[PDB]
Structure 1
Amino acid sequence: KNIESLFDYSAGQFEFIDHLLTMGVGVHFAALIFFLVVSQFVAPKYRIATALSCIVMVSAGLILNSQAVMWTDAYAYVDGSYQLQDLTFSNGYRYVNWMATIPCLLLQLLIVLNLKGKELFSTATWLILAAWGMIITGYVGQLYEVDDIAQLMIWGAVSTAFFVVMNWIVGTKIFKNRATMLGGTDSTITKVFWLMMFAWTLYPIAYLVPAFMNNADGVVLRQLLFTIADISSKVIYGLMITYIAIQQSAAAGYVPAQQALGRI
């Protein structure tokens, strides 16, 4: 049901995708260790924001690892090209994983925005409902990326509606609570918003690849887009969230944070 199943791959195409996914694994687990060791310099009220990055690193790292092994399982070098064998490859499992990772990305944002209690619970709930609506309708959509392009587009339109509404909630909370933020992170959080708009928008572009480049090179392009998007939306994003957590910790008087920033 996925366009990946339609083609044979050159050694070059096959190895590049393998390397992309493998590099993706290494980057996420490398970052995991960074987030782990810096977590001790985060004040208690923000420390969960950094823990969520650890959770995202392993979750994303495991899905990339799984995709890579699925890739090598599904294809074998036969008569001059990599051809589909008995096992299958699908991006569908990425969509399932987003059900967990996207709420984590959103939650760590709300935390450094200094949301608390009732407003935190209600905002998170609406955000998670919006994200799940987006992910589920998108998941259904890509089931048709070979059989019914028109259906892919319509489900994608519905998914985009959830996407836009989700982004509106995010933008609204960011620009409203920007003023509450310490240590100059009121400026930093603005760049985080634009990072999200950029990085998250790569995913619907990848989703549409079967519509504008239905060939083996389009398969490579999609994996390339996912890699750029994953690293940007999880790793670079996580680094900015953690930086914001540490800076606000130090400004709030948390001594290990102040000491940490003093060494650099």
Structure 2
Amino acid sequence: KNIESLFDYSAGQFEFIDHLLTMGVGVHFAALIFFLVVSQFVAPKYRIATALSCIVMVSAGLILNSQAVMWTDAYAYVDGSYQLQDLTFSNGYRYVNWMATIPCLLLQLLIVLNLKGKELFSTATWLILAAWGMIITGYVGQLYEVDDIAQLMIWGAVSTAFFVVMNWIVGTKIFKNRATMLGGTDSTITKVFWLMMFAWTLYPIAYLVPAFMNNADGVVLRQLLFTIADISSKVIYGLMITYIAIQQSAAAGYVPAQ
């Protein structure tokens, strides 16, 4: 059902896909430590933002590690190529970590934006529902990336309607609330939004690889696209978020941050 099941892979394609997944594990658990240590230097207000970054690091690192073992459990090097043995690998388990990390990524954005009370719970409910609708409709489409490519596009179309609306809600809250942020972070948050528009858009590109590159090098490209998009949406993003949390904690008079 996923194009990965359709192809044999050379030794170089297979251990490259393997090396991308194990490397992502190391990067995510290496940033987990960093997000853990620096949390003390964040005021109680924004401290949850760094904990969320710790959550997504482990959430992603566990799925990447799981994708790696499954990758090496499903294929066997036979007669000069790694051939599918049993059916254990699938991208579907990437969509199940998005359901969890995306709300965490989104929640820590509203926290640094200094939203609170009725607006925090309200804005968070519409963003998560929009996200979940985006991920769910996207999961239904990739189920046909091999069988029905027409269903892939229309489900990706419905998923894009949610993606666009979600971005519009994030962008609107960003520009209407940055004047409240401290330490000059009103300039930094804008760039994070642009970083967001960039890293998040790589996923639909990877989602469409089966449509314009249906072969073994397309599977390699998709993982590469995932890896690049996955470090920028979670690691770099979480790094930009922590800096803002620290900076505002200093401007607000929190010594450990100062």
Q: TM-score range by the shorter chain?
A: over 0.9
CA distance in 2 between counterparts of 1:235 and 1:4 reads: 26
Q: CA deviation at 1:87?
A: 3.4
Between 1:87-96 and 1:103-112, the stretch displaced more is 87-96
1:166 aligns with 2:174: no
Q: Distance in 2 between matches of 1:64 and 1:88?
A: 14
Aligned residue-pair number: 256
- Offset of residue 178 of structure 1: 0.7
What is the TM-score of this pair, normalised by structure 2? 0.99
Quote the Cα distance in structure 1 between the aligned partners of 2:95 and 2:230: 13
Task: Identify which range, 228-237 or 83-92, moves more after superposition.
Answer: 83-92
CA distance in 2, matches of 1:21, 1:175: 36
Distance 1:203 1:136 in 2: 14
CA deviations 1:43-67 (Å, max 9, x no partner) are 0000000000000000000010000
For residue 172 of structure 1, report the CA deviation from its aligned partner.
0.4
SS at match of 1:76: strand
> Which secondary structure does the structure 1 equivalent of 2:76 belong to?
strand
CA RMSD, Structure 1 to Structure 2 (Å): 0.4
Residue deviations 1:197-251 (CA, integer Å, cap 9, x gap) = 0000000000000000000000000000000000000000000000000000000
Deviation at 1:18, TM superposition (A): 0.2
Post-superposition Cα deviations, 1:177-211, rounded to whole Å, max 9, x if no partner, equal 11000001000001100000000000000000000
Shift, 1:89, TM fit: 1.0
Q: Tell me the distance in 2 between the aligned counterparts of 1:151 and 1:87.
A: 23
Cα displacement string for residues 78-137 of structure 1 (whole angstroms, at most 9, x for unaligned residues) = 011000002321001000111111000000000000000100000000000000000000
- After TM superposition, the structure 1 = structure 2 runs for residues 105-254 of structure 1, keeping only pairs within 5 Å, are 105-254=105-254
- Inter-partner Cα distance in structure 1 for 2:215 and 2:87: 20
Q: Secondary structure at the match of 2:208?
A: helix
Structure 2 runs not aligned, ≥5 long: none
Equivalent in the alignment of 1:98:
98
C-alpha separation between the residues in 2 aligned to 1:35 and 1:211?
38
